[PDB]
């Protein structure tokens, strides 16, 4: 799920190294997240975290071992659009949708360098 989400984000933002640009941004983008999102990018991360939390409730996802970001699915990037594959079973397809949505949200919101590596001393 993580490398596929990395690839999805580059599908939408071809200039980005997502694992570098969006990890540890604000309160939500990265491992965990808590507190009020600092901006709309952070709010895209918040929704993605909630999406993932939702996925873990599927008995389709519970049939698996992973850190949520290792539920590997199939998607294509074609002309900068993401298509989640009908080959994904239920869990993967749900995560595929979570990841497509966040990649698109990230491409539509402002990126604020101030919130990069934001001091967690109050999220």
Structure tokens, 42: 């952070």
Chain positions 54 to 83 lying near its own copies, rule: CB under 8 A, are: 74-80, 83
Stretch that binds Ca ion, among 21-29, 63-71, 73-81, 106-114 (CB under 5 A): 21-29
Terminal-residue alpha carbon distance, the chain: 26
Q: Which is nearer to its own copies, 54 or 80 (CB)?
A: 80
Q: How far apart are CA 56 and CA 113, in angstroms?
A: 32
Provide the angle, in degrees to the nearest 10, between the axes of the packed helices 90-108 and 2-12: 40
Among residues 70, 85, 89, 117, which is the contact residue for its own copies, using CB under 8 A?
85
> Does the protein bind Ca ion through residue 49 (CB under 5 A)?
yes
């Amino acid at each position: 799920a993580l490398w596929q989400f990395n690839g999805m984000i580059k599908c939408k933002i071809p200039s980005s190294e997502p694992l570098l640009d969006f990890n540890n941004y604000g309160c939500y983008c990265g491992l965990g997240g808590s507190g009020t999102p600092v901006d709309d990018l952070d709010r895209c991360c918040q929704t993605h975290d909630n999406c993932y939390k939702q996925a873990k409730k599927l008995d389709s996802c519970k049939v698996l071992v992973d850190n949520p970001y290792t539920n590997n699915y199939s998607y294509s990037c074609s002309n900068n659009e993401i298509t989640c594959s009908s080959e994904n079973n239920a869990c993967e397809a749900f995560i595929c949708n979570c990841n497509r949505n966040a990649a698109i949200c990230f491409s539509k919101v402002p990126y604020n360098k101030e919130h990069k590596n934001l001091d967690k001393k109050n999220c």
